[PDB]
């Protein structure tokens, strides 16, 4: 039963690797999931609710991985610690590029997708700023910009640069180089005087 | 004659301050410009070509201002020089927020808008990297990341952070704080070891 729902989600993710949400119909979803069209509408109100759920699962996966990291300090220098935290996003979203791309194009039209993204971005920026503040309180980072404004720009940078790399946009940082590039900007801007 | 065209462009920019492209019709454009609907179609193929031209004029205005800056060095420290160059974009796009917002939402659907944006971004990143390279050649900046990858991420950061500030997205850096925030990230990441 939760089976049919997972089948629908797995079909949508497979089809989104090939074409946009606009080019996928409810029948394609139903057909791929081994069900009828009215049976589909029982699990989801629309193909957009299917995308909404896929992005929800992707965002919550990253957010949980991040909480795991937070409760379990990695034992390394400062630079590697930022790298590990950014890496959560590089791997989680980079393992679901079709959902990332469609979820981002849907922010322009779907109020729920825009709100879901915006809640989590606020959470990840607040956490980033709490860490920068701890680093300043401990004397490891200088008091330059307002931690929260600095955290806002760096998280926006990552959203745009990661997602450009994953879609292979022109211009974009090659995906093999994007982690190194962002970590350098984060560590210089956070610790640089 | 070029009069009617300017009237149509000025009407579209005024209406875009109130509602999205989808909520504006060719008749609204024609009516505001003091012309008929078939007369409209003589100057522009569609309301989307009107947006395309508006964004074209905005992008070329910034690019020309930047060329002016380039040919006329401002006589100040390094930090102020980056601030002046970023400021070109903060003021040019920030003086046309409705076009910026609609032009960005149209990149998801219009191949010409996507290509126009992508050409200019490549140009501005190449110029940014040429400057970072000159600074490294002169011994003023360390050889850290590949200048071109560093320039890519910083320009993407600015596109996303400026445009979030202008739309008042949640989250965003307040528009009174966005210039300072980006300049700090640019100067630390470019000059920081
Ligand atoms: C330890 C440790 C170190 C760093 C972090 N963080 C720093 C990196 C930050 C990156 C967020 C990021 O790359 N994002 C891309 C899309 C939206 C957010 C996520 C929080 C978390 C834990
Ligand atoms: C002197 C001097 C110093 C710096 C520059 N530049 C540095 C700043 C750079 C900023 C570009 C920027 O903020 N963008 C927002 C949308 C797309 C590009 C534009 C090139 C140019 C001239």
Curated annotation (Swiss-Prot), chains A, B:
Homodimer. Keywords: DNA-binding, Repressor, Transcription, Transcription regulation. Coiled coil: none annotated. It comes from the Bacteria. Residues 25-44 bind DNA. Gene3D superfamilies: Homeodomain-like, Tetracycline Repressor, domain 2. GO terms for molecular function: DNA-binding transcription factor activity; transcription cis-regulatory region binding. InterPro entries: EthR_C, Homeodomain-like_sf, HTH-type_TetR-like_transc_reg, HTH_TetR, Tet_transcr_reg_TetR-rel_C_sf. It comes from Mycobacterium tuberculosis (strain CDC 1551 / Oshkosh). SUPFAM superfamilies: Homeodomain-like, Tetracyclin repressor-like, C-terminal domain. This is HTH-type transcriptional regulator EthR. Residues 2-62 form the HTH tetR-type domain. PROSITE patterns: HTH_TETR_2. Involved in the repression of the monooxygenase EthA which is responsible of the formation of the active metabolite of ethionamide (ETH).
